[PDB]
């Protein structure tokens with residue numbers, strides 16, 4: 001009915017490319033991922049299955065020849081990456097809250113049989129109230145279908161975030177890989193640095209971690225409570241690695257640290 005409601009002005013480059021689009025009539029904002037098909041099909045397919053408060057909402061897609069347009073939730077708070085101060089990290093209570101939200105999103109995805117495969121701060125966006133949303137399902141895949149798990153073998157992800165089994169084994173379970181990358185994200189949040197270029201014994205920093213030399217860099221900056229959680233996540237053997245239901249029982253995970261968003265108040 002309302003004449004111009006389907007018109008969106010592309011106002012600014014967010015990061016093919018991602019454009020911030022604003023509705024001509026309502027002024028509602030959305031992100032438009034523009035992909036020059038000249039993976040997308042899978043990405044759209046996967047997005048249509050998604051509906052969760054810690055996952056970037058998918059509004060739809062439009063053809064237009066060789067260009068694919070994916071309409072996605074706009075996250076005005078930007079990337080989590082930008083909230084991490086180099087060599088420092090961020091306040092522990094903030095890191096805990098983002099970690100809780102990240103686990104909520106991951107539990108949701110795993111519950112529907114989807115693995116993201118590329119969790120890292122660049123792919124974790126923040127809304128207007130600093131709620132974290134998992135983004136970019138370009139590398140995502142179905143690991144469970146009709147209640148049967150399929151083992152993965154494709155090497156996907158980003159080296160500093162990738163689990164060591166993906167470098168050492170032909171096949172591996174999907175879920176522990178996403179848990180591992182969440183561990184590296186937690187490290188980045190608390191220390192403002194990545195612990196190693198990749199989880200290989202040829203990597204001095206990685207061997208040092210396996211030898212428990214936590215008086216070294218990023219580890220010494222942590223705090224014993226979140227560090228004990230990291231000791232459970234960053235375990236080389238994915239079969240021994242902590243699972244999400246057990247992360248949710250962790251002492252640090254459950255430690256009261258952060259006050260809720262401060263609301264207006266006065267005194268009489």
Ligand SMILES: CCn1c(=O)c2c(C)n[nH]c2c2ccccc21
Pocket residue numbers: 014015018031056072073074075076077078079125135
């Ligand atoms: C360029 C990376 N990027 C996105 O991909 C995206 C999406 C999708 N929604 N909101 C954003 C977004 C918002 C602020 C800054 C970067 C962003």
